[PDB]
Every structure is written in structure tokens, then in C-alpha cells.
Design a protein around this ligand. Structure first.
Ligand SMILES: Nc1cccc(Oc2ccccn2)c1
Ligand SMILES: [Cl-]
Ligand SMILES: [Cl-]
Ligand SMILES: [Cl-]
Ligand SMILES: [Cl-]
Ligand SMILES: [Cl-]
Ligand SMILES: [Mg+2]
Length: 348
């Protein structure tokens, strides 16, 4: 066991191993508080997240276990991984607090899309890396569920990492009105008309790629219905066969109430873009999720000819998610989480 030291920074007690120095507050959602620190063991600048109320309900205890299992699994150059996890507790009986340690990220895509001039070569390399990471994620039967520019970290050498996996977190208030939290989501799951599957992420990559090419949000809806009207004007309304896949009669009568519209000419929407970029956008932004290109298929598209290497596009170890269908008590979820903290082995 390392030696721990205690301090109060911005109304919060932080108890952390001596290896972590020069702690400085950086942010706090409702999920936890974050400090920047210098890790003396590895020489990296890191983010230290202290979870808030990790075991306050069955829902919160299960979400704590879910986040730790997912972070311990992810070992890929284009996906955030876990540098450390710790608790100052010396036994299960006194276990209350969980701290997570990752690489400190600087800029996100938003910073570079808003204020930088992007060549077609920059768009090829950024989208290649998103798809390389998604091939790995999807090979473990994980769905990200929240891909958007603020969840993509990018450095001065245009190298990219995926972060902030969807933990079944986002609330109704958070998805309401003129908000970036909804602009990248798939049409079939906008109002939960179909169940989630890894195909919804491929819609989000198309929305990101369009915005890197134009500098503008593709579907900036003022509410769920305005956003559906912008989507169907570009990709076309559905036909009878596809419509039948939505179980809810009300949604189909709602779908059935809009005037029919054809798919638009994407060369006349994305004026001047590389024709191979236009071709790949037509294969991602398909209304029927069964017909979208997969991450593994997209890596072999001619748009990525200068970067594609099928001997350096790895898949994941198998991921057991059977816990998701399991009914347990708060203390059972807490004991599973404790075992995962104490069994952690750090990377090389
Ligand atoms: N991916 C998919 C799945 C079922 C139906 C479908 O068509 C539509 C049409 C309009 C709005 C939403 N989904 C698309
Ligand atoms: Cl230490
Ligand atoms: Cl990492
Ligand atoms: Cl503790
Ligand atoms: Cl965003
Ligand atoms: Cl597993
Ligand atoms: Mg985020």
C-alpha cells in the first residue's frame, strides 16, 4: 500500500498517494470533481477524478461498477485508457471513495473545428483514427452512444483519442431544445423508436465528418421535431418496408403524416469536397441502420488509402457484460467494485 496524504481544495477532501503532486482543480459535472496533477511514477500530466456519491442508490452503485469495468478493458491508441484507480480504504468495511486517473487531455475537436483551417489531408487522418478506435470498441460488442466533437481529444500532431463513453447518463432536460448534446444522435433513437445498437455510432461519425468539411453543424435542430425535419430533407423520407421496423403505431402515423421527400444530391450539399469524401458520407448517413457502412468496412474505403494498414488495425479482447441483466443489492455492487479496484494492474 502506498502512503496517502490529505488536503482540502475547493470545499473537497482529497486523499491520494504521494506519487500525485501539484493538484489543481479543473472542473466538476454531477458525476465527480477533477484535479490536474503531475504523476512522479510515470512523468505524465494526469486527470484525477474523485467520484461523487458513488454508492448512493442501486442505480448509482451499478453505474460506478459499469464505468470501472469499461475503463479497465480499453487498451487501444485511439481510446482513453485507465492509468490508475485507488481508494484510501484499507478494507471493504471502510470503503466509501473511488478515484480514477487518466492522461490529462488539452484540446478537443471543437477547438480545432471552430478555430483552425483543415485540409482534406487533416479530415482523412482525423476520421481514420475515429474509425480505427470504433473498430476496436465494436469488436468487444460495446456501443459508445455519445460521439460528438467535445468527446474527441486532439493534440498538436493531429493525434486523436475517443473518451466519455455513454454510461446511460443523459437526462430529458439535457436533450431538450437547441443543444449539441442531441445534434449528433441517430434518427431511429432520437425519440427511442428503435433499441440502441453499434450502428447508431456510425451516424455520429458522418455528422462529425460533415462538420470538419464545412465548418458548420450538419443538423442543428431547435428541438427533436425540427432536427428530424432537417435529417429527412437530406436523406429522404422512409418507404413502407423500413417504416414497419418501428413497433409504435403512433410514431408510424407521425412518420406517415409528413409529405414524401427524395434523398438530396450530396455533391451539391458538400460543394467542392473530395468526391471520395462525398461517397463515404452517402454510405454513413443512411436512414435504415441495417444498411450503413460498418467501421471495419469504412477503414478499407479508398478515401483512407494513404493511412489504411490492415495489419495495424487491432480488435479487442472479449468483454463480458452479463452484469447488465443482473439484479443485486447496493452492498453487492459495492463489493464487486472493491474487488476491481484491488485487482487493477497498471500498463507497462
Ligand atoms: N434506422 C431505422 C430503423 C427503423 C426505421 C427507420 O426509419 C425512420 C424514419 C423516420 C424516423 C426514424 N426512423 C430507420
Ligand atoms: Cl505513492
Ligand atoms: Cl490513454
Ligand atoms: Cl474510502
Ligand atoms: Cl460537442
Ligand atoms: Cl470480460
Ligand atoms: Mg464529454
Amino acid at each position: 500500500r502506498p502512503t496517502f496524504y490529505r488536503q482540502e481544495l475547493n470545499k473537497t477532501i482529497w486523499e491520494v498517494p504521494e506519487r500525485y503532486q501539484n493538484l489543481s482543480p479543473v472542473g466538476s459535472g454531477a458525476y465527480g470533481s477533477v484535479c490536474a496533477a503531475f504523476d512522479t511514477k510515470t512523468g505524465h500530466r494526469v486527470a484525477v477524478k474523485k467520484l461523487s456519491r458513488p454508492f448512493q442508490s442501486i442505480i448509482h452503485a451499478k453505474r460506478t461498477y459499469r464505468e470501472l469495468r469499461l475503463l479497465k478493458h480499453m487498451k487501444h491508441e485511439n481510446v482513453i485508457g485507465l492509468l490508475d484507480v485507488f481508494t484510501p480504504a484499507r478494507s471493504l468495511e471502510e470503503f466509501n471513495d473511488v478515484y480514477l486517473v487518466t492522461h490529462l487531455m488539452g484540446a478537443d475537436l471543437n477547438n480545432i473545428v471552430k478555430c483552425q483551417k483543415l485540409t482534406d489531408d487533416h479530415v482523412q487522418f482525423l476520421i481514420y483514427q475515429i474509425l480505427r478506435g470504433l473498430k476496436y470498441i465494436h469488436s468487444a460488442d460495446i456501443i459508445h452512444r455519445d460521439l460528438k466533437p467535445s468527446n474527441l481529444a486532439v493534440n498538436e500532431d493531429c493525434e486523436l483519442k475517443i473518451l466519455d463513453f455513454g454510461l446511460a447518463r443523459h437526462t430529458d432536460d439535457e436533450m431538450t431544445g437547441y443543444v449539441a448534446t442531441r445534434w449528433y444522435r441517430a434518427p431511429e433513437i432520437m425519440l427511442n423508436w428503435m433499441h440502441y445498437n453499434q450502428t447508431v455510432d456510425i451516424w455520429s461519425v458522418g455528422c462529425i465528418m460533415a462538420e470538419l468539411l464545412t465548418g458548420r453543424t450538419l443538423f442543428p435542430g431547435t428541438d427533436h421535431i425540427d432536427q428530424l425535419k432537417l435529417i429527412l430533407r437530406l436523406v429522404g423520407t422512409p418507404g413502407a418496408e423500413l417504416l414497419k421496423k418501428i413497433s409504435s403505431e403512433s410514431a408510424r402515423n407521425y412518420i406517415q403524416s409528413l409529405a414524401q421527400m427524395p434523398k438530396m444530391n450530396f455533391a451539391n450539399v458538400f460543394i467542392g469536397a473530395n468526391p471520395l469524401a462525398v461517397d463515404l458520407l452517402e454510405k454513413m448517413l443512411v436512414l435504415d441502420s441495417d444498411k450503413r457502412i460498418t467501421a471495419a468496412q469504412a477503414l478499407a474505403h479508398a478515401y483512407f488509402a494513404q493511412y489504411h494498414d490492415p495489419d495495424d488495425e487491432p480488435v479487442a479482447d472479449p468483454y463480458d457484460q452479463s452484469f447488465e441483466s443482473r439484479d443485486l443489492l447496493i452492498d453487492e455492487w459495492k463489493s464487486l467494485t472493491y474487488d476491481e479496484v484491488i485487482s487493477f494492474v497498471p500498463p507497462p
